[PDB]
Amino acid sequence: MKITLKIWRQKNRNTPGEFKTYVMDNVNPDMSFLEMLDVLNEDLMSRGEEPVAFDHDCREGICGMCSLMINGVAHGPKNAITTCQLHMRSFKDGDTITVEPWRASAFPILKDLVVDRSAFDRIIQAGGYISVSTGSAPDANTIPVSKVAADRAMDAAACIGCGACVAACPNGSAMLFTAAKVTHLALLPQGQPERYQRVVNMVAQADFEGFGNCTNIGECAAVCPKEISLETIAQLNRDLVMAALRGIEPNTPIVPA
Amino acid sequence: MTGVLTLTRTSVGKKVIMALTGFVLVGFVVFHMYGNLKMYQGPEVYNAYAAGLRELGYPIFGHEHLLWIARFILLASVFLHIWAATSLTLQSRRSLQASSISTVRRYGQHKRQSGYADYTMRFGGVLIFFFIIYHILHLTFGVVGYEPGQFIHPHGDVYETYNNVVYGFQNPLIVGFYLLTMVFLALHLYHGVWSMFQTLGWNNRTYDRLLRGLAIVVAAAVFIGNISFPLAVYFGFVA
Amino acid sequence: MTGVLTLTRTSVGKKVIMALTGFVLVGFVVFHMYGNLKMYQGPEVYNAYAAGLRELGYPIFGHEHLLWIARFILLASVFLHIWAATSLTLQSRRSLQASSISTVRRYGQHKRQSGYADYTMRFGGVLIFFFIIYHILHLTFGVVGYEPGQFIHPHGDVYETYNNVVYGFQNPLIVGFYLLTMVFLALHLYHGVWSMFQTLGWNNRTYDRLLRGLAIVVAAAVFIGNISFPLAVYFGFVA
Ligand code: HEM
Ligand code: HEM
Ligand code: HEM
Ligand code: HEM
Ligand SMILES: CCCCCCCCCCCCO[C@@H]1O[C@H](CO)[C@@H](O[C@H]2O[C@H](CO)[C@@H](O)[C@H](O)[C@H]2O)[C@H](O)[C@H]1O
Ligand code: SF4
Ligand code: F3S
Ligand code: FES
Numbered sequence: 001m002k003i004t005l006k007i008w009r010q011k012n013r014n015t016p017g018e019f020k021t022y023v024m025d026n027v028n029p030d031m032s033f034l035e036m037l038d039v040l041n042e043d044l045m046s047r048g049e050e051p052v053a054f055d056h057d058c059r060e061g062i063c064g065m066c067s068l069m070i071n072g073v074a075h076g077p078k079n080a081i082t083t084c085q086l087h088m089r090s091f092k093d094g095d096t097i098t099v100e101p102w103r104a105s106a107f108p109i110l111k112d113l114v115v116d117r118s119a120f121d122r123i124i125q126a127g128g129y130i131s132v133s134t135g136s137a138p139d140a141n142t143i144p145v146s147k148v149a150a151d152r153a154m155d156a157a158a159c160i161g162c163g164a165c166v167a168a169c170p171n172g173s174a175m176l177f178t179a180a181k182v183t184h185l186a187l188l189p190q191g192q193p194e195r196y197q198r199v200v201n202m203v204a205q206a207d208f209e210g211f212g213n214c215t216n217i218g219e220c221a222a223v224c225p226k227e228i229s230l231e232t233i234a235q236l237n238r239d240l241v242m243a244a245l246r247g248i249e250p251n252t253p254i255v256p257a
Numbered sequence: 258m259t260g261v262l263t264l265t266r267t268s269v270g271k272k273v274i275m276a277l278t279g280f281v282l283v284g285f286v287v288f289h290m291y292g293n294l295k296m297y298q299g300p301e302v303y304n305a306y307a308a309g310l311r312e313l314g315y316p317i318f319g320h321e322h323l324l325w326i327a328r329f330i331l332l333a334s335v336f337l338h339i340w341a342a343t344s345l346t347l348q349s350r351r352s353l354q355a356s357s358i359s360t361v362r363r364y365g366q367h368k369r370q371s372g373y374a375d376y377t378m379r380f381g382g383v384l385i386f387f388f389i390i391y392h393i394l395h396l397t398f399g400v401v402g403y404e405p406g407q408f409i410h411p412h413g414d415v416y417e418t419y420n421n422v423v424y425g426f427q428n429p430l431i432v433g434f435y436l437l438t439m440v441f442l443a444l445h446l447y448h449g450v451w452s453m454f455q456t457l458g459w460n461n462r463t464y465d466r467l468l469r470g471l472a473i474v475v476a477a478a479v480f481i482g483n484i485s486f487p488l489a490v491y492f493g494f495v496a
Numbered sequence: 497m498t499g500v501l502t503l504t505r506t507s508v509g510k511k512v513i514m515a516l517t518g519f520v521l522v523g524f525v526v527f528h529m530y531g532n533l534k535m536y537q538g539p540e541v542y543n544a545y546a547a548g549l550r551e552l553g554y555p556i557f558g559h560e561h562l563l564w565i566a567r568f569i570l571l572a573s574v575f576l577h578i579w580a581a582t583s584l585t586l587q588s589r590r591s592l593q594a595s596s597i598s599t600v601r602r603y604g605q606h607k608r609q610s611g612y613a614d615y616t617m618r619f620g621g622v623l624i625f626f627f628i629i630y631h632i633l634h635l636t637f638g639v640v641g642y643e644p645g646q647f648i649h650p651h652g653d654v655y656e657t658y659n660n661v662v663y664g665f666q667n668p669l670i671v672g673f674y675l676l677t678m679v680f681l682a683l684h685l686y687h688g689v690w691s692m693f694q695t696l697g698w699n700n701r702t703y704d705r706l707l708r709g710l711a712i713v714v715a716a717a718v719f720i721g722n723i724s725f726p727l728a729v730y731f732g733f734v735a
Pocket of ligand 6: 160161163164165166176177223224
């Protein structure tokens with residue numbers, strides 16, 4: 001397999017970037033995309049060039065650190081998988097493929113393909129939790145949770161925080177991430193006592209961080225690696241409407257350190 | 258603590274305001290097309306409908322009271338829709354200016370897998386705004402795009418809306434503009450009828466396909482009727 | 497997963513379908529009797545009511561617009577009622593065929609302590625079905641039960657329903673058929689008006705006697721109102 005790559009190359013935040021082309025003559029069809037990037041980096045270091053920088057920790061599709069925009073589709077052309085899971089047996093000999101970071105105002109670009117995703121952490125910090133301190137927990141089987149509710153909560157809770165939903169929608173909205181967290185915490189009884197405040201706070205924080213609105217387009221669900229469905233956004237909308245009917249006011253925003 | 262006004266503060270609250278306003282506006286559009294279908298019945302029935310709009314419960318509700326209430330509600334809804342649209346569009350435009358190759362291109366390559374709703378919705382909204390202004394100025398008042406000595410204002414209790422319509426869609430430019438606006442409004446409804454149900458949260462796995470079908474049928478009906486009117490007027494089917 | 501159509505799968509869902517359909521049909525029966533009460537006023541008022549049915553919201557809706565919608569809803573409800581009734585009757589017949597003395601009996605001796613509702617409802621339902629078939633073919637269309645040159649079809653915008661009524665109930669057989677059908681429908685309502693509330697689950701200790709009394713009064717009112725007509729026409733008190 002002979003593969004032509006068009007990699008986004010940016011030195012830092014202030015320095016503008018551009019596309020650069022690299023040709024790889026020999027490619028093993030069954031090695032993953034990130035391993036191809038590793039071989040390319042090794043070749044660049046051997047030649048005397050600056051290696052391509054990208055995020056990767058687990059290479060299993062669970063940690064959520066890997067983040068690439070390949071051929072215009074987040075996490076590669078195949079769906080329901082992350083960038084680390086994308087093996088390039090799904091590409092074609094002689095193909096020309098372009099790789100870019102996420103593009104958003106809330107995800108500043110730090111290097112060639114590395115972005116700053118701390119806005120998700122700040123969204124979580126503003127209410128995305130259950131305020132229970134250590135040692136005060138009751139017995140495990142005190143509160144029953146139906147199997148269906150627990151299953152839906154687990155479906156919403158399996159979000160790896162990759163940020164591909166933000167890079168999918170044109171509006172640059174974090175609605176899928178916020179909705180998934182709100183749905184996960186709102187389907188269990190332990191999340192009841194502060195849910196109507198929680199959603200409002202979280203939504204406000206997203207507006208504070210620079211994300212756009214949701215036009216209900218639906219790119220995020222088609223890109224999301226964990227098949228998080230649009231019912232999470234409907235649940236968030238129901239919760240926010242109910243909170244507005246109660247006169248719940250958002251708290252002060254979480255300012256970064 | 259302010260109450261239901263809290264929807265003004267957040268983006269989702271503006272979206273909810275927009276959804277309720279869209280409910281009202283979709284209802285008005287459907288009812289208006291249904292009422293305008295009467296021009297095929299004849300000038301007598303059309304003028305009777307136009308007169309009876311003002312005399313809506315005339316013995317009990319007075320003259321033009323209900324029509325003025327409906328007009329006020331429609332104006333309030335339209336203004337709220339415009340305000341929320343402009344605010345949300347500016348906010349979503351700010352989310353892309355920092356990280357983009359150019360001011361006209363976000364990614365060097367981006368392939369969409371769920372439609373082009375944003376472009377269609379926003380451009381159709383602007384076009385619909387301009388069309389509403391021109392249509393009100395052109396058929397309700399008859400002061401623009403109309404030959405002199407051809408508009409008959411309501412003189413007392415007699416209405417000549419059939420004459421105004423049959424003499425309105427005669428310039429090909431006007432009928433082309435109307436057809437363009439109606440295409441964009443068809444796309445607008447085709448997305449928004451489902452989008453407003455999703456925004457209020459009245460959606461799940463069971464009802465998604467049903468709501469999509471309802472949106473499709475509503476948009477198709479409105480488009481067919483509202484393009485049948487001026488084309489028929491221009492070609493001479495309605496004389 | 498499919499949603500509300502899950503009511504088709506179980507027997508209780510079919511009973512719920514019957515309950516909603518019975519709500520609609522009871523409403524129609526009461527309204528229809530109330531409307532037919534007007535023929536004691538005279539031919540002018542009766543013909544005015546018949547004409548005004550076809551003209552509801554004259555300057556808003558079209559000619560026979562609401563009437564056709566109501567007709568479609570009534571047809572849909574009646575068809576659902578018939579389908580559910582047939583299905584459940586066949587099921588309950590199956591439940592009582594393996595173990596039973598003879599074939600038209602179930603117990604060597606059996607003494608009911610809560611009324612003969614099943615026989616009444618089923619036989620009255622069959623009779624009401626046949627009666628509706630005859631009634632639409634008798635007064636709405638006028639092709640049976642008439643000496644030639646006695647039924648005046650609606651010509652243009654005039655109605656002669658008073659003439660058709662006074663020329664309809666002259667055969668003693670027809671008025672007797674109407675007598676029998678109205679008796680059976682009285683029993684049908686006397687049970688169903690309470691059964692619907694019990695089936696939908698809106699019944700407590702407090703409301704049981706209230707709902708039974710409401711069923712009694714509705715059945716008696718409908719019976720008296722709908723039996724006063726053929727006797728009056730046959731005896732000549734309405735001419
Ligand atoms: C080509 C099809 C259309 C025709 C022929 C048409 C015709 C008319 C006419 C004749 C009136 C005046 C009513 C009267 O004098 O009694 C009117 C009013 C109006 N039309 Fe339309 N219309 C059309 C499409 C639309 C559409 C698509 C919209 C929505 C944007 C619209 C919005 C209005 C509004 C807002 C009014 C004023 C209502 C009021 O003030 O009470 N029209 N139209
Ligand atoms: C003919 C009258 C109109 C109707 C019936 C209508 C209907 C709708 C509906 C139902 C929605 C979805 C609401 C939601 O999901 O929350 C919507 C969205 C939208 N409409 Fe309209 N609309 C109309 C006119 C306009 C106008 C005049 C504009 C702007 C000038 C506009 C701009 C928009 C925009 C921008 C959105 C999407 C908001 C976003 O960015 O997320 N529309 N419309
Ligand atoms: C005049 C119009 C009719 C009305 C207002 C009416 C009303 C009702 C009502 C209210 C019920 C009880 C609903 C429930 O408990 O869920 C019922 C049950 C029933 N109706 Fe009707 N009905 C009508 C015509 C008919 C017809 C035409 C048939 C059959 C040909 C029929 C056969 C039955 C049967 C068999 C049941 C009970 C079956 C069961 O419990 O499984 N009815 N009806
Ligand atoms: C003996 C009492 C009754 C009288 C005097 C009576 C009178 C009439 C008359 C004159 C018509 C023909 C006019 C028309 O088509 O609307 C009619 C039609 C009709 N009647 Fe009756 N009726 C009686 C009993 C009933 C009852 C109890 C029902 C309810 C099940 C019923 C259901 C209908 C229906 C469905 C139509 C056809 C209406 C339409 O769709 O056009 N009738 N009735
Ligand atoms: C025809 C009448 C309508 C046309 C005229 C009105 C449209 C012109 C206004 C353009 C937008 C300005 O509108 C203004 O937007 C800002 C920021 O977007 C909103 O600002 C508020 O909401 C946003 C998100 O929704 C958050 O940052 C925060 O909660 C707060 O700042 C204001 O609540 C709104 O008043
Ligand atoms: S919602 Fe999906 S796409 Fe968005 S961060 Fe979570 S896992 Fe990634
Ligand atoms: S694709 Fe974008 S517009 Fe909303 S529904 Fe998902 S964040
Ligand atoms: S590197 Fe952990 S999800 Fe890909």
